Each structure stands twice: as structure tokens, then as C-alpha cells.
Amino acid sequence: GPVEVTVWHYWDGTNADAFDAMVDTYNASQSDVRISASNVPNSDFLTKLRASATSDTLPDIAIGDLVWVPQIADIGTLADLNGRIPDDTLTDVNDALTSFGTIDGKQVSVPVSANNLGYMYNKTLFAEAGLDPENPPTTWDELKAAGQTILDETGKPGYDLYTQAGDSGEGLTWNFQVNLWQAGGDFLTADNSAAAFNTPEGAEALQYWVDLIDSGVSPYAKWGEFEKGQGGSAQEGSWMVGIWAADPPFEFGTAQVPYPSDGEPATNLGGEQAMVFENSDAEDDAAADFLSWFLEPDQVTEWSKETGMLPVLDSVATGSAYLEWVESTEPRLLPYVEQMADAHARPNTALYPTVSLAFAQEIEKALAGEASVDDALDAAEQAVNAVLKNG
Ligand SMILES: OC[C@H]1O[C@H](OC[C@H]2O[C@H](O[C@H]3[C@H](O)[C@@H](O)[C@@H](O)O[C@@H]3CO)[C@H](O)[C@@H](O)[C@@H]2O)[C@H](O)[C@@H](O)[C@@H]1O
């Protein structure tokens, strides 16, 4: 009988139905491996893995959020996927995501879905303000000026900023990182040992946020006005194209995230990564056989099409097949697809969640008007370095 391989994931809905259909397809396509997939709730997933390490009942495959990988790598020994998944598959996978998935030299994760942040806007409100509803802003200066027009002409915020840290800080941090990278900035140093953002580039990105808030274009603590149909625009994840293209709350448009004339295009990557917990070389190779099949172009194309998630393979994101389909079926996803070339991943440190909250709490003081841009970047660097240095 087949090698039995367990997969834990947190997908629900369409995504879980799609994944179960692909498991069925793989299971019926050969007799050497049988995949048994289970849903574990997103909020329960890490705590289940910690208990499972203690009870020696870890799954063979875990599929987790990007920022979980480094934490999971400390819960249980992860197999190296290099030499298990075909070299040409791993080369094709988005480089930011294979780099992210490299811990102690081993390819301990591979992405199996992707998403990124984009610019979404309300065409009806743009038109009401006297803007061209088909011509979104392309630069920071264009966004500030178009947002100012929306505020001046309609009394509504031109652009939402994610300005409150909340429980994790990640809404603020991961929206800010986009603009830090577009300014030519870095978040941590290349070895994740220290902050790298307390720079002219960092101050350019934070001064952008503070200028938007100070003008009233992006009020402090007013996230979600855009989503209510009461706001010009917002950074939104690619998953929103799918949620809205079905039952839209208003006529929305999408674009590349506006970037500074003195800078470069950038965005931030989300999505799910697969990890194989090390057992025997036979069992690791059984698990990696399923992941190899899952990462072939035909699977990645059909999976992306049906879930609205962005493909993890460069060859699919840039392929005529997939692009023609996006143009025919979900054309507002195209800017998100094109951004896969410029997208960055967060740093692969196991302290990232603590780093991100320490960062977000200090930066929020500048957004709230309680600190200067220079003092908040100094404070954020102190908080982050204390978290990184002291472990
Ligand atoms: O962009 C606003 C968002 O920012 C933070 O979350 C960052 C994570 O966003 C992604 O996860 C999203 C899923 O893809 C969606 O299908 C859905 O469940 O929403 C989550 C985020 O809530 C990304 O895949 C992750 O890698 C990112 O870390 C805030 O914490 C969120 O509250 C905001 O929604």
C-alpha cells in the first residue's frame, strides 16, 4: 500500500475545496503516496504544532503563513527540500520566497500560494472629485495631490493608511515596509541582526505617511473608510480582487503601488508556505513528491485560477496562458501579478512577530502626532534592536 503522508493546512471555503480536489487528483494519479489533508484553524495552528512536537505526532507537511516558517523551524526539524523537489521547479519559484524559505542553508519551506499588496481605488469617488476614473496615481506625489483633490472636493479621505498597531502590529508594519522598500530602504540588515530602516530612505517613507495624515488626506485611526465606499483608495491585498470582483461594494480599480519618482517599485509578499517535518529519507521524499506535483506549472496555473491566489512560479506569472486568462476573467488582478517581479519578503527571523509589534508601536506615535519622524525612527530602531539582540 502507499506511504501515508499527512498535511495540515488552515484553508476554508473555496480554497479548502480546491486543495481537497487537488489532493484527490494526486491520490488517484499514482499508488506510491496517499495524502491525508486536515484543516487546523489559523488561530490554533502554531499551538497545535508545539503540542504535537512534545507528543511526537507532528504532521508530515504543515502549510502555514509566510511569517510562521522561522517559528515552525524551531518547533520541529524541517527537511531540506533541495534535492527532493526538482531543481528546475525551485529555480522557477519566486526568488524572494525561496530565499525567505532558506534557514541554516536548507530550503525548509516552499511557497504554495502567494499574494501581494496593491493599490485599490474607488472610480466613482475619483470621478466625483474631478479625477480621471481610469488614471490612478503612479507616484507618491500623484497620490498626495489626487488624494488632496478628493478631500477638497468631497470631504472624504483620499487614501486610507493602516495607522494602528492592533494586537500584532502587522497591518501597520507590512503596509509601511512597501513604502520603505520603494524609497530604497531596508527593514533589517541582511543577517536579521539589527534594524536597517533608520536612514534617509526610512525617513522619506515615514514623512510620506506623516504628510498624508497632516494634510487630512489619510486621517489617523481611520482605516476602512475606503472599504465602506467612503474613501478614495487604500493599499489592499490581491485577495480583495476576488472577494470584491464577485459582490463589489462599489466600482473599484487596481494598480501597481504608487512609488516615489526618486525610488523603485516594490510590494510585500503574503501567502502559504509548505514545510516537511523530517522523518526517514523515504518519508521526506514521499511528502516532497506531493509538493513537487503541486508545484508543476499545470497544477500552479489551475490552483491560482480557481483560488484567486497569485502563482508562485515566475514562468506562470509571466506566461501567456495565465496572463490571457487574467485579462479575460479577472483583469483587475493583472497589476498584482505583474508586481510579483518587484515583491519583497519580510525577514525570516523567528523574532519577526516581536520585531513587528515593537516597530509598529513606535512608528504609530509619529502617525498619532505624538513624536517627530526622526524621533519615531530612532525609537523604532531602539525597540527592534533590543528585541533582536537580546533574543
Ligand atoms: O493588509 C491588511 C492586513 O494586514 C495584516 O495582515 C498581513 C497578512 O496579510 C495576508 O494574510 C491575509 C490572507 O491572505 C487573507 O486571505 C485574509 O485571511 O486576511 C489575511 C490578513 O488578515 C498575508 O497572506 C500574510 O502573509 C500577511 O502577514 C493585518 O494583520 C490584517 O489584519 C490586515 O487584514
Residue numbers in the entry: 31 to 421
What did the published study say regarding this structure?
Gene products encoded by cmmC, cmmD, and cmmE were suggested to form an ABC transporter system of an SBP (CmmC) and TMDs (CmmD and CmmE). Because our study revealed that the protein specifically binds to CMM, CmmC was termed CMM-binding protein (CMMBP). Functional analysis revealed that CMMBP specifically binds CMM with a high Ka value. Therefore, the present study suggested that CMMBP plays a key role in the “three-stage” metabolic pathway of A. globiformis because this protein is tuned for specific binding and intake of the cyclic compound, CMM.
The CMMBP crystal contained one molecule in an asymmetric unit, and the refined structure was determined at a resolution of 1.47 Å. CMMBP adopts a typical “SBP fold” consisting of two α/β domains, designated as the N- and C-domains. The two domains are connected by three hinge regions (144–146, 300–302, and 359–361), and a long β-strand penetrates both domains. Although we did not add any ligands at the crystallization step, an electron density of three or four glucose residues was observed in the cleft between the two domains. The tetrasaccharide appears to be connected by the central α-1,6 linkage and two flanking α-1,4 linkages, suggesting that this compound is a MM. Because the electron density of the glucose unit at the nonreducing end (Glc4) was ambiguous, we modeled a trisaccharide (Glc1–3), which corresponds to a panose, in the crystal structure (thick sticks in Fig 4B). Glc1 forms a stacking interaction with Trp269, and no hydrogen bond interaction was observed. Glc2 forms a stacking interaction with Trp204 and several hydrogen bonds. Glc3 forms a relatively distant stacking interaction with Tyr192 and a direct hydrogen bond with Trp204. As evident from the position of the N-domains, the CMMBP structure adopts an open conformation.
